[PDB]
Amino acid sequence: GFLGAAGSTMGAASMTLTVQARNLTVWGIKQLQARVLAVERYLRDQQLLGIWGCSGKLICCTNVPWNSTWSNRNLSEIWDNMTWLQWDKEISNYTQIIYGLLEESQNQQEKNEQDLLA
Amino acid sequence: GFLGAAGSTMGAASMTLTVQARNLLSGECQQHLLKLTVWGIKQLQARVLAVERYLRDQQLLGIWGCSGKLICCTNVPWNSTWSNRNLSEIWDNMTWLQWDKEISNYTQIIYGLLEESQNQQEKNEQDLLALD
Amino acid sequence: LGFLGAAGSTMGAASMTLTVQARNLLSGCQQHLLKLTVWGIKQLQARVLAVERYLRDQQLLGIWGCSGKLICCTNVPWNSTWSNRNLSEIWDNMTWLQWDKEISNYTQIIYGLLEESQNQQEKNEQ
Amino acid sequence: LWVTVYYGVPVWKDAETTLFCASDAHNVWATHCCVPTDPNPQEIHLENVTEEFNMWKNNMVEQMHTDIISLWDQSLKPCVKLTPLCVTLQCTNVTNNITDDMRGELKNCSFNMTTELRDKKQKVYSLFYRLDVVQINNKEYRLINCNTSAITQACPKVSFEPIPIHYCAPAGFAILKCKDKKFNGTGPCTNVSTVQCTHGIKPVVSTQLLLNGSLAEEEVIIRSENITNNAKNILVQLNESVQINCTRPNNNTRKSIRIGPGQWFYATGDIIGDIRQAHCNVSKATWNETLGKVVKQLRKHFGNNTIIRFANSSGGDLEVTTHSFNCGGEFFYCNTSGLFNSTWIITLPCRIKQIINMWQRIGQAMYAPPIQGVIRCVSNITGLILTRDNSTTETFRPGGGDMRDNWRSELYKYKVVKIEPLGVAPTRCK
Amino acid sequence: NLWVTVYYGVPVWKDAETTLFCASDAHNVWATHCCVPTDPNPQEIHLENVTEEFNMWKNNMVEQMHTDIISLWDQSLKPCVKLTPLCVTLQCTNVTNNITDDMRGELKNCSFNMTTELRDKKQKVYSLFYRLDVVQINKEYRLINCNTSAITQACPKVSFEPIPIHYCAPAGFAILKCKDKKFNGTGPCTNVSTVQCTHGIKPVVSTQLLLNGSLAEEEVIIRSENITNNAKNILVQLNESVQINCTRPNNNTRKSIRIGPGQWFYATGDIIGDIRQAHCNVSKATWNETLGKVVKQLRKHFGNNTIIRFANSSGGDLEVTTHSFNCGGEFFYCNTSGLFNSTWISITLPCRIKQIINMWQRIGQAMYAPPIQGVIRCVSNITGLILTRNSTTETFRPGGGDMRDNWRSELYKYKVVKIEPLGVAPTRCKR
Amino acid sequence: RAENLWVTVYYGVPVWKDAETTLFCASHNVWATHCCVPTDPNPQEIHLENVTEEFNMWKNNMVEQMHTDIISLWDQSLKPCVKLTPLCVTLQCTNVTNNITDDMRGELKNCSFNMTTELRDKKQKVYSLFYRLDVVQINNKEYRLINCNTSAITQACPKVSFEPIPIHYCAPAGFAILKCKDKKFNGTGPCTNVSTVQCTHGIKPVVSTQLLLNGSLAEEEVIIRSENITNNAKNILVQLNESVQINCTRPNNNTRKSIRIGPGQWFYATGDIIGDIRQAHCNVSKATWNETLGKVVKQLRKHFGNNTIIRFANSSGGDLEVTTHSFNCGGEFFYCNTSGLFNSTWISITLPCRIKQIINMWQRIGQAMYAPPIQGVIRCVSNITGLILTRDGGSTNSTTETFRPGGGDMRDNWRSELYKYKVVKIEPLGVAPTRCKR
Ligand SMILES: *[C@@H]1O[C@H](CO)[C@@H](O[C@@H]2O[C@H](CO)[C@@H](O[C@@H]3O[C@H](CO)[C@@H](O)[C@H](O[C@H]4O[C@H](CO)[C@@H](O)[C@H](O)[C@@H]4O[C@H]4O[C@H](CO)[C@@H](O)[C@H](O)[C@@H]4O)[C@@H]3O)[C@H](O)[C@H]2NC(C)=O)[C@H](O)[C@H]1NC(C)=O
Ligand SMILES: *[C@@H]1O[C@H](CO)[C@@H](O[C@@H]2O[C@H](CO)[C@@H](O[C@@H]3O[C@H](CO[C@H]4O[C@H](CO)[C@@H](O)[C@H](O)[C@@H]4O)[C@@H](O)[C@H](O[C@H]4O[C@H](CO)[C@@H](O)[C@H](O)[C@@H]4O)[C@@H]3O)[C@H](O)[C@H]2NC(C)=O)[C@H](O)[C@H]1NC(C)=O
């Protein structure tokens, strides 16, 4: 219902992204501060998608390949017989590099857009 | 023409959109107001709420695949349980307020259907890319 | 290759790296300061203001049809009154800082043109 | 056939939000906000609608009330308190060149007040008005509010003259307005338009009489929530104003008295010249002419054949039974009985009081320090408030008092809604 | 030959700390505090195949509840009357009229010179005090807190009944709960769900005996941070409720003394009828059996054949040696030593009444409780115990004082995490 | 009909403009508990290759930010402390006459008074010692405190120190802090060695007058700066390239007594001094001083010519807080006589110091703060890093000119520390001419 697929396989969870995607006295200042933070967290994730050319997509396909050093696994090892919580922990080492790679793939295409239209 | 609408025909709602959607983020001596902690906090939180409302619409249009559109088509059929009007009067001759009025009772379900339509479309796109 | 250390590069070269700068606006005990009922609000205001500015710029790109891209293209020709230089003269032998001050009075006018051009483009598509 | 999403629709709903304070740029209302008014306010003629308005349910009135109190409190909150003066007083009568009509109103009181040192006293005396002093048990007197509340001093460096303030909507909101002239107050008017900014309203605090407000354009307008229920008040907006001239009688001075380590009290000092009674002058004809118009507008609701009488008010608190008027922070309490003594088909004596309570929040009193010399107070009567006291006769008497009536009266034609730009309809497109 | 795809809305999370919203059922201090209604029918979603590690001893929301309950209490008192002018030399006597023998000297009838609404006038008044709050100098007495700090008066209209409050997560966060029976306080639980908010928890403050909280459901459950060590407390939930009936039987009146320019002091008035000691009744028929159950569970940790003794408290102040109980605004200090006398292998607890009361043992601010007129009878449930600690025998004694454990004892089954919707995964697609 | 140039637009442009914003502080005492944000443990600096930028220390808002925050902390920390209102009573004072050096005669007054106890109906007769600077004569044994006819006074809390712990200021996202790395920066103009940082280095919030203590030292030569050098009415800020050590002491062995003046309100009264009575003073190497100044004149001559003789003069006018060197160490407040420090011209110096306990901060008239007594004796060693001077000229005499010690406006102290810094905001969007047409 909220995290209904949390214990499931990547395959099973593939159609549930919309489920998570949408869930966003002086004393009361604390609640305001929390609201402000939630907005800020939201926006940084949205920017990252935009700069990767993933604006508007839940499942964005890019031009960056997978390395065997990030994941030494195949289809029945990654999607099946696996769950997102564990898997994400398993590859946490490469989060930063992938993001840098995604930015570069986008930059390389945009330059070819202004020119190639010409 | 900030709200130069009122309603006549829906064709008129197209031309007013840029302004209506822009008005949301309109974008000095306020130093002495910082100390007014009650007066000032109300004004501040109000700004925050305005931001939330803006984002709520953008996010919803985004999930529906309507971002960047003024008019958004999708493969979700209209139901006789929602309305029974022809397609002539309801644009060309009917104003908008009645449209807000009768359709007000049922809406959520529509939003869920719009989301599902996109959910299915994107998975199909991924397969089309994987295949031929 | 650094953060604002492109400022001295020609505009063309500087433009090769935009993401670094693009993300700079969206980032960011710790209890003692909660008693500062005036100071703490100022800090809250500061971050709220930063958010509004970020969003304002994004909305403009939306209006102009340039959203979702760091770099976009439009249908508005250049007006020699804003500046009168050739292409090489601008992309090379030029810092963005200089460029910006040279055309600092021709900004809002372009924005108006961009908005109407995009409005007409939508009218043409409908 | 198909569901399509639309945006930019002319749709709105009732809402409660926070409005901005805008002004024209050293006063309660001068250093209280920074937003400039719109130098050229625009109006959107949001016509071809019959928008339902109310005024008895107006969210704007409630925030005006809340915020004016807050502003008032912010002004007084940091100012010196008068606790050291809540002592037994030794008083006698001021009979020096006294008009008999004012006899007994001004008192000469002395007391033992501390000095800047914790171990020393000073003998101090000042003058008081009778309305602020109570006899203990003929020499011993008390400040009237020592048994009820703390009293603070309004700071003499703060002006209290009202300024028109414009309210402005936040983005995503709009204020709907009637351009009608004969609007009931709760009707579905046809003259509908919308604004981001209201007409500025100068806050006015007064009782039994609406001063410095707007006038009706076509006729005298009578409004109430329920005319039938005597519990509701009656408010009248005149289409012509009436001039009223109120003045001080006496060229008074004041004394700056050291009361503590950085604290000062500003006492009423003696009077230059002879003692005279405070009063207000209104044209007798104008008042009679104005009433005639008002009555003709009552008959249309109460019957052409009934007898209409105006009468002296009920008993009650000073702020209820007399006309309470703020002139530069000084308060006049004018006897209006002479204005309501007629049935058909001018000098008002005024009392002066310095220990005053605003908006009936019993508990927080304030002392109004004196203004030097004689001043003139001149204002525009734009309306008033009455109550309803067989079928033979109908009698009306002065009402109001509750400040929400002054604000509501001025905010006659405005409503607040929120904008809802998204919607969904059937069409032909897949 | 797999390529990168970015997935948004992935159902994963990590440990986190944030601000929670308070909510209620819609002049009680917590009624005016929470202006948010709860979900009329709160949601809970079972998470199939999710194992999650919880740790009640490191549960950060506990710190938040403790901090906020303090903030609110204190805020409640901030705008109330200060009693500084009443810190005077007192003239007191032995009012022992119509009393039982154990009350001989419990009350002091004191009189003094104090202010009136005018600075230059004085009045003589008198009132009754409990000896716990009055100290003899070398007839001459002083209030007990005159040599420590300021004393203020609670506002008489404000009540403190512990109306249950629910805590709800902000967007981007989620509350995880263990529905796993016999949850051990720490470690992975394998029966979990995600919830919008916690259930309502009553902000009951006590020492030694935990009142009106959650039950253990299946058996008595003993939890501690470290079982081996004796430097840690032990928190025990009972599955059965134990009923306790408390009273202060004397019919008291109140008087209102004008003390100054615009305010009042609420003084102890007179007493109607005989004076008897305050006390609490625990049925022996339940308590005996209750400890036997506790011991049976202790045998799972300490040999299986040891002799377990219950005993009185260690030395300490009133707050920890007696049971601290509040009802109706009055503070009872009940002698529980006879509640912990037996060794394993009706009960009347006399109670003292204190009026000038430190709260949460944080030194600086003394609050004066106005008297409650009439008599009082309170009935409540003991739902748990706070206990502290040779190859053949061990002894247990009552504990308390650190209120964070009371909060901890209800919140032991909850965890807060943040949602991290962006994931990256391979696919047979390139573009 | 045209060459067909087309407007284009893009985001991520390295352009900034001057902006005024609020920077935040990063780092038991007043500064530590209010600067909870840690500094970046690994600070960065990015040189802006081939970039020139203009800085102006005289129009710097970072200075104003320091001023406001330094005031705010003083008020925030004194606000909750014991008020000393009840001490404004008639005092009966005599001279302390026991083992007093001649120079200290009349400096210490032994005053007795009737004070409030913890109970409303009880009084106590107490006494303590005061410095004469805090007490005034009534009409001859009858005295009162100097603040009785002006304002309330608050006792500083004994547990809150005001040690000048260095703090850093750091930009919020969207802003950048720029600095000059260049040399001989005039305080104004287009320095070329420019870089930006996330956060500045730490700056010690040292408060002083006349002599600027514990600041940065110049790289190689004395630098003289003024908003207007040729305006004799303006302050001249001089940064030295060699520090001068100064050794200060308060030799009297003090004690304290603590008296209840209410329910939990402890007044810290001066305890008797045990031992002989001596003057507080500072020791400056005589040679170092009559070495270090030679280069000051040499550099003054860069603006005034080296055919003029420059004199350093004493007895600059103003109040105690202006004419003496305002020094605060250990929480003790010293008023050091520097007249012999500025009595020389050309082609170990002991400076006596007075002590005052009733003190005012940043010339905020009508509010005061009592400096509690300190146990024992003190010793402080500090670095003289710069001077605040004014010209005594304007006369028709170019042959000789005199300068005198100046200052008192604390913003100039911070201005010197903030000399090299500026703040701008980032504006990532821009427009330029492009071949592509949508
Ligand atoms: C220029 O820089 C120099 C160098 O930093 C500055 O001079 C230094 O100033 C500090 C503070 O005055 C001084 O530090 C004290 O040295 C004493 C040596 O005997 C220590 O005994 C003393 O310790 C106390 O304070 C500590 C605070 O951290 C406590 O942790 C410690 O337990 C002590 O606390 C007792 O005493 C205090 C009162 O002093 C009392 O409140 C407590 O309750 C408790 O009883 C400090 O460590 C340095 O020694 C000085 N160094 C030099 C060379 O002089 C100089 O001031 C700067 N110049 C300017 C203008 O700012
Ligand atoms: C564990 O949980 C139990 C169950 O809730 C708690 O027991 C309650 O304790 C409160 C606090 O003492 C009781 O509240 C009081 O009840 C009085 C009796 O009410 C009846 O009789 C009067 C007679 O005049 C009728 O008017 C009324 O309708 C009822 O029939 C009330 O008189 C009290 O109100 C007065 O005092 C308060 C003081 O603050 C004032 O504010 C009020 O205005 C008024 O003057 C009050 O409501 C409650 O009745 C008990 N419930 C039950 C079922 O017994 C335990 O206290 C709790 N344990 C712990 C440790 O928290």
Ligand SMILES: *[C@@H]1O[C@H](CO)[C@@H](O[C@@H]2O[C@H](CO)[C@@H](O)[C@H](O)[C@H]2NC(C)=O)[C@H](O)[C@H]1NC(C)=O
């Ligand atoms: C939790 O684990 C169980 C057990 O593996 C899952 O049950 C399977 O559900 C699918 C539904 O299409 C059936 O085809 C399988 O035969 C079931 N497995 C077994 C052993 O019977 C359950 O779906 C999992 N839940 C989540 C959220 O992942």
Ligand SMILES: *[C@@H]1O[C@H](CO)[C@@H](O[C@@H]2O[C@H](CO)[C@@H](O)[C@H](O)[C@H]2NC(C)=O)[C@H](O)[C@H]1NC(C)=O
């Ligand atoms: C109504 O408005 C008039 C005009 O502003 C007020 O009378 C003036 O008040 C100002 C306030 O500074 C004085 O400077 C003028 O001299 C006054 N004009 C006169 C006395 O002729 C009047 O007080 C307002 N009335 C009310 C009830 O607020």
Ligand SMILES: *[C@@H]1O[C@H](CO)[C@@H](O)[C@H](O)[C@H]1NC(C)=O
């Ligand atoms: C600075 O200019 C030189 C040429 O003088 C050039 O070689 C160098 O790359 C430039 N540096 C930058 C800003 O890239």
Ligand SMILES: *[C@@H]1O[C@H](CO)[C@@H](O)[C@H](O)[C@H]1NC(C)=O
């Ligand atoms: C001041 O006090 C004295 C002594 O009680 C009394 O005689 C005198 O009348 C008082 N003076 C005033 C002005 O109240």
Ligand SMILES: *[C@@H]1O[C@H](CO)[C@@H](O)[C@H](O)[C@H]1NC(C)=O
């Ligand atoms: C007009 O206002 C009066 C005043 O109470 C009310 O009685 C009457 O019903 C209103 N009429 C309508 C429907 O506008």
Ligand SMILES: *[C@@H]1O[C@H](CO)[C@@H](O)[C@H](O)[C@H]1NC(C)=O
């Ligand atoms: C008020 O005073 C003016 C003169 O300033 C006079 O002309 C006018 O008639 C007076 N009005 C009334 C009602 O007294």
Ligand SMILES: *[C@@H]1O[C@H](CO)[C@@H](O)[C@H](O)[C@H]1NC(C)=O
């Ligand atoms: C005064 O009232 C009487 C009685 O109604 C009327 O006849 C007369 O004309 C009125 N005078 C004025 C000036 O209106």
Ligand SMILES: *[C@@H]1O[C@H](CO)[C@@H](O)[C@H](O)[C@H]1NC(C)=O
């Ligand atoms: C009343 O309003 C009119 C404008 O309609 C103005 O000319 C006149 O001066 C005002 N009179 C008073 C006393 O404010």
Ligand SMILES: *[C@@H]1O[C@H](CO)[C@@H](O)[C@H](O)[C@H]1NC(C)=O
């Ligand atoms: C009040 O003060 C007088 C002073 O003479 C003393 O005799 C009396 O006993 C005091 N009364 C009380 C109740 O303390």
Ligand SMILES: *[C@@H]1O[C@H](CO)[C@@H](O)[C@H](O)[C@H]1NC(C)=O
């Ligand atoms: C269960 O609780 C005991 C303490 O009673 C502790 O030592 C043990 O590690 C806990 N088990 C787990 C899985 O955390």
Ligand SMILES: *[C@@H]1O[C@H](CO)[C@@H](O)[C@H](O)[C@H]1NC(C)=O
């Ligand atoms: C006490 O326990 C009984 C039985 O479990 C339950 O019905 C009752 O509601 C409980 N009362 C309180 C205050 O917890």
Ligand SMILES: *[C@@H]1O[C@H](CO)[C@@H](O)[C@H](O)[C@H]1NC(C)=O
């Ligand atoms: C424990 O039990 C013994 C035997 O009945 C009794 O004498 C003693 O007083 C009891 N102690 C307590 C604290 O109840």
Ligand SMILES: *[C@@H]1O[C@H](CO)[C@@H](O)[C@H](O)[C@H]1NC(C)=O
């Ligand atoms: C106290 O010392 C001063 C010098 O500061 C002296 O003038 C005065 O006469 C002395 N007092 C007495 C009583 O001798």
Ligand SMILES: *[C@@H]1O[C@H](CO)[C@@H](O)[C@H](O)[C@H]1NC(C)=O
């Ligand atoms: C340095 O500042 C002074 C201020 O009086 C100015 O006259 C001089 O021209 C400046 N020098 C440079 C190199 O900018």
Ligand SMILES: *[C@@H]1O[C@H](CO)[C@@H](O)[C@H](O)[C@H]1NC(C)=O
């Ligand atoms: C100051 O200079 C004068 C000469 O004008 C000299 O007599 C005196 O001793 C000098 N004093 C100091 C402290 O240097």
